[PDB]
Amino acid sequence: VNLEEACLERCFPQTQRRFRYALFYIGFACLLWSIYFAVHMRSRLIVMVAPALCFLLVCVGFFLFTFTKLYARHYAWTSLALTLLVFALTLAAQFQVLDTCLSQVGSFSMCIEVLFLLYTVMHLPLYLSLCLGVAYSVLFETFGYHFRDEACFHWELLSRGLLHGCIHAIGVHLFVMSQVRSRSTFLKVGQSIMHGKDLEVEKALKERMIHSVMPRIIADDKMQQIEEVSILFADIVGFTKMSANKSAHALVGLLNDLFGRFDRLCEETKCEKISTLGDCYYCVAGCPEPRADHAYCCIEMGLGMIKAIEQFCQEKKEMVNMRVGVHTGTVLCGILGMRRFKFDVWSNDVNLANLMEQLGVAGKVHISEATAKYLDDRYEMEDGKVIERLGQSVVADQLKGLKTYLISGQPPINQFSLNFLDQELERSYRTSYQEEVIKNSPVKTFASPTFSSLLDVFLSTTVFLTLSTTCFLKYEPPPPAALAVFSAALLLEVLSLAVSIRMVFFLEDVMACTKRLLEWIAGWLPRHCIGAILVSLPALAVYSHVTSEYEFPVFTGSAALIAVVHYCNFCQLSSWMRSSLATVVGAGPLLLLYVLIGQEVVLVFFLLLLLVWFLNREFEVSYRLHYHGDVEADLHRTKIQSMRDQADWLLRNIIPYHVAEQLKVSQTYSKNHDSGGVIFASIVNFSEFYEKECYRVLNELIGDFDELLSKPDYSSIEKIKTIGATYMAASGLNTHPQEHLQILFEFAKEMMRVVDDFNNNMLWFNFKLRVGFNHGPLTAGVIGTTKLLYDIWGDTVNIASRMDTTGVECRIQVSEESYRVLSKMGYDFDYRGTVNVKGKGQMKTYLY
């Protein structure tokens, strides 16, 4: 009931505006009646004209009430007060009159107009309005017969009751339809405002997802050759000891705040964080925006990382340090792949920066000669001394004479033509009924265009029959012309009713051809033609009983009063045509037939016609506005589903399926896997092909790779990320005991096949995709709060990257652990020897 109070509040201007117009009408109606009374009924003026001018003051007093705040709270009470006042005046006028006599037609006009004011343009409860109207109508008819005059003037009583029944039927139907449009619009305009609020709060989710995989500058809208870029790398020394004797939730927790501290420091540094490779944290400075201070901000974050880890060391009581290595130079950045694509930087300089981190000492910033060229005496500078620190190891074989150095610190509706301002909406409005039939939309509410026609046709049928029933009661020889119109109308009436019920219920007797013409009838032009005759069908019965023996007079005018009233029905049609037809088919015929009784009919129809003209205008714009809320409601629904689909897909671009539900429950996710496999696959000979123009072909190969995860057989494999030219993927995150491990090989076995095929279209150059492979315990987890990031790290991942380093062309290097189950199935495998592995000594590694 709380929503109802808001419904009245929003519709309160409509109720207030309508009630004010009623006061203008009744004041104008009483003004004209008194003027006619003061001219042709001069016999008894003060007993009759005084209430008219007195009621003019009543309208003025009621107009004064509208501005008072009491009317705002109690608009319903004021409307009822006018009801009894106008009721008292009209009933007294009927009694008081009976050159000293007034025709019953004038009395009937007062009854019809006041009944229509109460039903339509007053906004009262249905039971109260109906009961008041029937009580008022029953007293009006009873008084007239009781107080009828004999000096001037069975089925007779039933005739008036049928006339009064028609007025209530149209008034009630107009009233219930008026409420339906108001309630339907209020609910659906409110639905629009809730979709609009949800769209803004759901669009921010989409922008957050884009920001989780791309820089802000790139997010404004696919590769670059930006020079003078300082690259950072770091390693959490002692992370292996942290991994042991630690829970998965606690381990990722210590990383989450540690990375966040880096990110907050990065925000002050205003650098860019590309990605975090497990415990490593590598970032770039100088791209995409051409920053001229790139070398220094890398050192500040590098030295700040040393400070930040120490503060984290004293907060979480951990024994960790930092090993920062920065190398500056040219770099290539962009987006690779169609799924799980992230911003990354690729070059030979980047790999040297990663190596320089491995050559560093904990708590130090290990810079290159290139970075030292951009550094002033603001910072102390030391000899790198890596040659004697680590000896002549394989890792340091490729320094190639580059001296290294270290750092320790420091309402669109026109009033006249009643049309939409936007012609685009106007065209869609006219075709609304046709497409409603075309789509076969089910009947939802009382405001459906197909259902509205059904109720309008039914009302037109009973209005015509009840009105015509009394006409035949007068005669009970009727002229043959009257009989022809009645039978022809009935034949068309039942056919129109049959069409409407079939257009709504859609009986199984329908068939393709009759559905084609049904849509054609729904068009604007042919619906107007059938509606115009149907609306005038009750009116034609009145003037088909008129012949050369007229001089009968009172009843035809009394029946024509209802005929012009019936034109308020069929609200779906244009109000101007219906109102015009009322003037030319409801008032015109009798006006010519009469062409003081002659003055009285002119005044009676003029007052009634203007009420019909205004009521149709008010009810039409209510129906126009209802469809205006319909086009706005459907647009907001399609806007929401557009951004809903966009955001969910970018969720799929960051986290896999199994992480989406858990993230919806808690802000953090973690998992430790007993057994899992990781695959590395790098395009090695790209350096020979590299010389931005070459990388575009590389993008297609990555795009071709992305289609493999779209294959139905690789649904158990979800790639982690693409780094360098390498392709990293894992099998077993979503989990034969090692069925996942086979398909990871099966995914791998398809990896070089497409590489060989992709080389067919190129000219005298073939790409080679060396692959590393090993399986074991691995740890996943989501990193970041405002920027999500998914990664898997551990000893299993690190050696696979090592096997990617120590690999050969198109061969799947396999460690001991996979061999304990891979050769058991039947895979054909070979031997190569042993390679260096950190943390396990020399390792027995084979090939496919």
Tell me, yes or no, whether 668 and 808 share the same domain: yes
Which amino acid, residue 676?
G
Residues facing residue 775 across a β-bridge = 677
Question: Is 240 among the annotated ligand-binding positions?
Answer: yes
Residues facing residue 726 across a β-bridge = 723
Pick from 609, 630, 653: which residue ends a domain? Answer: 653
Tell me, yes or no, whether 639 and 716 share the same domain: no
Please report the DSSP string for 637-693 in residue order: HHHHHHHHHHHHHHHHTTS-HHHHHHHHH-S--EEEEEEEEEEEEEE-THHHH---T
Contact 803, 815 (CB under 8 A): yes
**Which residues contact residue 359 at a Cβ distance below 8 angstroms, ignoring those fewer than 6 apart?**
325, 366, 384, 386, 390, 395, 396, 399, 404
Is 472 within a domain?
A: yes
d(CA 157, CA 727): 94
**From residue 147, how far is each of 35, 99, 555 by CA, in Å?**
25, 18, 19
Single out the residue of 626, 794, 765, 632 nearest to residue 698, CA to CA. Answer: 765
Which CATH number belongs to the domain containing residue 838 in this structure?
A: 3.30.70.1230
d(CA 807, CA 799): 12
Pick from 629, 653, 677: which residue ends a domain? Answer: 653
Strand arrangement of the beta sheet that strand 332-335 belongs to: 223-224, 332-335, 343-346
Question: Is 800 among the annotated ligand-binding positions?
Answer: yes
The token pair that represents 602 in the structure block: 């002119």
* Residue 282 phi, psi dihedral angles, 5° rounding: -115, 135
d(CA 542, CA 470): 10
**DSSP state at residue 583:** I
d(CA 781, CA 668): 8
d(CA 757, CA 479): 93
* Residue 450 phi, psi dihedral angles, 5° rounding: -75, -40
Single out the residue of 205, 258, 255 nearest to residue 646, CA to CA. Answer: 205
Single out the residue of 250, 273, 275, 284 nearest to residue 790, CA to CA. Answer: 275
d(CA 741, CA 722): 20
Pairing relation of β-strands 812-814 and 769-782?
Answer: parallel
Is 210 within a domain?
A: no
Is 211 within a domain?
A: no
Contact 259, 783 (CB under 8 A): yes
* Residue 793 phi, psi dihedral angles, 5° rounding: -140, 160
Residues in the chain: 848
Could you tell me the end-to-end alpha-carbon distance of the chain, in angstroms, rounded to an integer? 73
Which amino acid, residue 52?
A
Tell me, yes or no, whether 649 and 756 share the same domain: no
d(CA 179, CA 176): 5
Single out the residue of 47, 61, 169 nearest to residue 119, CA to CA. Answer: 169
- Integer-rounded Cα Rg, in Å, for the chain is 44
Q: Is 212 helix (H, G, I), strand (E, B) or coil?
A: coil
SS (H, E, C) 743-787: HHHHHHHCHHHHHHHHCCCCCCCCCCEEEEEEEEEEEEEECCCCC
Unique residue bearing structure tokens 């039942």: 494
Tell me, yes or no, whether 700 and 621 share the same domain: no
Which secondary-structure segment (H or E) carries 142? Answer: helix 126-146
Pairing relation of β-strands 321-329 and 229-233?
Answer: antiparallel
**Which residues contact residue 534 at a Cβ distance below 8 angstroms, ignoring those fewer than 6 apart?**
457, 460, 492, 493, 496, 570
**Which residues contact residue 495 at a Cβ distance below 8 angstroms, ignoring those fewer than 6 apart?**
none
Single out the residue of 512, 650, 626 nearest to residue 204, CA to CA. Answer: 650
Q: Is 58 left (phi over 0), alpha (psi -120 to 50) or beta?
A: alpha
d(CA 241, CA 211): 33
Which secondary-structure segment (H or E) carries 195? Answer: helix 155-211
Question: Is 793 among the annotated ligand-binding positions?
Answer: yes
Please report the DSSP string for 584-648 in residue order: IIIIHHHHHHH--HHHHHHHHHHHHHHHHHHHHHHHHHHHHHHHHHHHHHHHHHHHHHHHHHHHH
Is 422 within a domain?
A: no
Tell me, yes or no, whether 146 and 230 share the same domain: no
Single out the residue of 274, 574, 309, 303 nearest to residue 419, CA to CA. Answer: 574
d(CA 22, CA 137): 19
Domain ranges, residue 795: 657-847
Give the burial string for 397-413 (b: 16+ CB within 10 Å, else e): eebeeeebbbbeeeeee
Unique residue bearing structure tokens 């990617």: 804
Q: How far is Cα of residue 134 from the mean position of the Cα atoms in its chain?
A: 47
Is 23 within a domain?
A: yes
Largest CA distance in the chain: 138
Q: Name the domain count of the chain.
A: 4
The token pair that represents 596 in the structure block: 């003081």
The token pair that represents 775 in the structure block: 């399986």
Single out the residue of 420, 416, 384 nearest to residue 402, CA to CA. Answer: 384
Which secondary-structure segment (H or E) carries 322? Answer: strand 321-329
Unique residue bearing structure tokens 């951990």: 318
Contact 446, 180 (CB under 8 A): yes
d(CA 528, CA 569): 13
Give the burial string for 370-395 (b: 16+ CB within 10 Å, else e): bbbebeeeebeeeebebeeeeeeeee
Contact 744, 729 (CB under 8 A): yes
d(CA 283, CA 304): 13
Pick from 630, 653, 676: which residue ends a domain? Answer: 653
d(CA 295, CA 293): 6
Unique residue bearing structure tokens 């109260």: 128
The token pair that represents 633 in the structure block: 């409601």
Q: How far is Cα of residue 459 from the mean position of the Cα atoms in its chain?
A: 38
Please report the DSSP string for 217-276 in residue order: TGGG--EE---SEEEEE--EETHHHHHTT--HHHHHHHHHHHHHHHHHHHHHHT-EEEE-
The token pair that represents 237 in the structure block: 């020394």
Question: Is 302 among the annotated ligand-binding positions?
Answer: no
Residues facing residue 388 across a β-bridge = none
Contact 782, 788 (CB under 8 A): yes
Residues facing residue 333 across a β-bridge = 224, 345
**DSSP state at residue 121:** S
The token pair that represents 121 in the structure block: 């343009």
Is 393 within a domain?
A: yes
CA torsion through residues 106, 108, 109, 114, sign: positive
Single out the residue of 440, 374, 437 nearest to residue 407, CA to CA. Answer: 374
Contact 353, 327 (CB under 8 A): yes
Question: Is 170 among the annotated ligand-binding positions?
Answer: no
Measured at the CA of 762, the angle between CA 756 and CA 765, to 5 degrees, comes to 75
The token pair that represents 451 in the structure block: 């259902």
Question: Is 239 among the annotated ligand-binding positions?
Answer: yes
Is 708 within a domain?
A: yes
Tell me, yes or no, whether 711 and 842 share the same domain: yes
Question: Is 277 among the annotated ligand-binding positions?
Answer: yes
Contact 360, 325 (CB under 8 A): yes
Tell me, yes or no, whether 22 and 98 share the same domain: yes
Question: Is 279 among the annotated ligand-binding positions?
Answer: yes
CA atoms within 13 A on the CB side of 502: 17
**Which residues contact residue 235 at a Cβ distance below 8 angstroms, ignoring those fewer than 6 apart?**
279, 280, 322, 323, 357, 358
Contact 848, 804 (CB under 8 A): no
Which amino acid, residue 207?
E
Give the burial string for 254-279 (b: 16+ CB within 10 Å, else e): bbbebbebbbebbeebebbbbbbbbb
Question: Is 721 among the annotated ligand-binding positions?
Answer: yes
Tell me, yes or no, whether 644 and 667 share the same domain: no
Question: Is 792 among the annotated ligand-binding positions?
Answer: yes
Q: What is the resolution of this structure in A?
A: 3.5
Residues facing residue 326 across a β-bridge = 232, 367
Contact 45, 37 (CB under 8 A): yes
Unique residue bearing structure tokens 């920027």: 787
Q: Is 66 left (phi over 0), alpha (psi -120 to 50) or beta?
A: alpha
Q: Is 751 left (phi over 0), alpha (psi -120 to 50) or beta?
A: alpha
Single out the residue of 97, 116, 113 nearest to residue 36, CA to CA. Answer: 97
Contact 83, 117 (CB under 8 A): no
- Tell me which long-range contacts 274-277 makes (C-beta under 8 A, separation of at least 24): 274/343, 274/344, 274/345, 275/342, 275/343, 275/344, 275/721, 275/723, 275/789, 275/791, 276/783, 276/789, 276/791, 277/723, 277/791, 277/793
d(CA 192, CA 187): 9
Quickly count: other Cβ atoms within 10 Å of residue 609's Cβ. 17
Please report the DSSP string for 494-555 in residue order: HHHHHHHHHHHH--TT--HHHHHHHHHHTSHHHHHHHHHHHHHHHHHHHHTS--TT---HHH
d(CA 634, CA 436): 14
Tell me, yes or no, whether 523 and 649 share the same domain: yes
**DSSP state at residue 694:** T
Question: Is 278 among the annotated ligand-binding positions?
Answer: yes
Q: Is 828 helix (H, G, I), strand (E, B) or coil?
A: coil
Quickly count: other Cβ atoms within 10 Å of residue 76's Cβ. 16
Unique residue bearing structure tokens 């037939």: 593
Is 485 within a domain?
A: yes
Please report the DSSP string for 358-423 in residue order: HT--TTEEEE-HHHHTT--TTS--EE--HHHHH-S-STTTT-TT---EEE-----B-TTT--BSSH
Tell me, yes or no, whether 124 and 238 share the same domain: no
Contact 303, 364 (CB under 8 A): no
Tell me, yes or no, whether 235 and 349 share the same domain: yes
**Which residues contact residue 417 at a Cβ distance below 8 angstroms, ignoring those fewer than 6 apart?**
576
SS (H, E, C) 715-731: CCEEEEEEECCEEEEEE
Quickly count: other Cβ atoms within 10 Å of residue 760's Cβ. 7
Which amino acid, residue 474?
K
Question: Is 743 among the annotated ligand-binding positions?
Answer: no
Tell me, yes or no, whether 633 and 700 share the same domain: no
d(CA 232, CA 272): 10
Contact 387, 396 (CB under 8 A): yes
CA atoms within 13 A on the CB side of 470: 26
